[PDB]
């Protein structure tokens, strides 16, 4: 393959977009002459390949060079979630419902699987050519693609703590699309949970009028972990189903 730049650099760790026989690729590069390596690598990688799903990113491949593994993973034009959000541009809004619920089944899938992602948020929700959203940025895809943090985790990562993240994710994607279609809304900012908050208040009227998505992500926005919905619950949701 042919390296064009570097998407990221860390210690032990690079990620290379490169043109792999006429196509574009993402090659994170890392050393596992270590057995601590070694094992660690396996597991990684095993946390993404264990997955089959549409929304979740695919590993092409693995291969060795000495002590250095090679993983070939999608190099996506469209960028993320964030990077469309930054256009500006108004998203339709059957649209969106079609990709949060994308969003959401990947979750359930993860979680169904043991697998809790740990960071979701939109620049971490890359897009596909077809333009299904695709989650990135966990296992060994790590570095391939606040208000976000669970109350609770201000006092670890849960499946409870990615519903909060995920909730936040489709509500910046709410306020910013509706004020995308009607300026008067004003530019959003995402809220932040008060001390002796219940629950983030959603209004209907900040998400352009739609009291059912305002519901859904009213009910992953619940500080007791306990009383948030899960992945399957808000998949339930009138909004999604």
């Given at each position: 393959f042919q390296v064009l730049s570097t998407l990221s650099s860390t210690v032990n760790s690079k990620v290379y977009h490169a043109l792999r026989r006429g196509e574009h690729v993402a090659v994170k590069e890392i050393s596992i002459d270590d057995d601590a390596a070694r094992r660690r690598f396996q597991r990684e990688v095993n946390i993404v390949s264990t997955c089959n799903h549409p929304n979740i990113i695919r590993i092409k491949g693995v291969f060795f060079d000495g002590p250095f593994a090679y993983i070939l993973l999608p190099y996506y034009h469209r960028g993320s979630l964030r990077a469309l959000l930054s256009k500006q541009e108004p998203m339709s809004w059957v649209a969106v419902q079609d990709m949060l619920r994308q969003l959401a089944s990947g979750v359930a899938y993860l979680h169904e699987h043991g697998?809790?992602?740990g960071d979701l948020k939109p620049s971490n929700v890359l897009i596909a050519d077809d333009g299904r959203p695709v989650i990135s940025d966990?296992?060994?895809?790590?570095?391939?693609?606040?208000?976000?943090?669970?109350?609770?985790?201000?006092l670890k990562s849960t499946g409870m703590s990615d519903m909060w993240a995920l909730g936040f994710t489709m509500l910046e994607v709410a306020l910013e699309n509706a004020f995308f279609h009607?300026?008067?809304?004003?530019k959003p900012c995402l809220p932040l949970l008060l001390p002796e908050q219940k629950r983030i208040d959603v209004p209907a009227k900040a998400v352009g009028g739609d009291e059912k998505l305002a519901e859904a992500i009213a009910s992953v926005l619940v500080a007791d972990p306990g009383n948030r919905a899960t992945a399957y619950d808000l998949l339930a949701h009138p909004y999604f189903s």
């Open positions: 697998i809790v992602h966990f296992g060994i895809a790590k570095d391939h693609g606040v208000q976000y943090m669970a109350p609770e985790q201000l009607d300026g008067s809304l004003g």
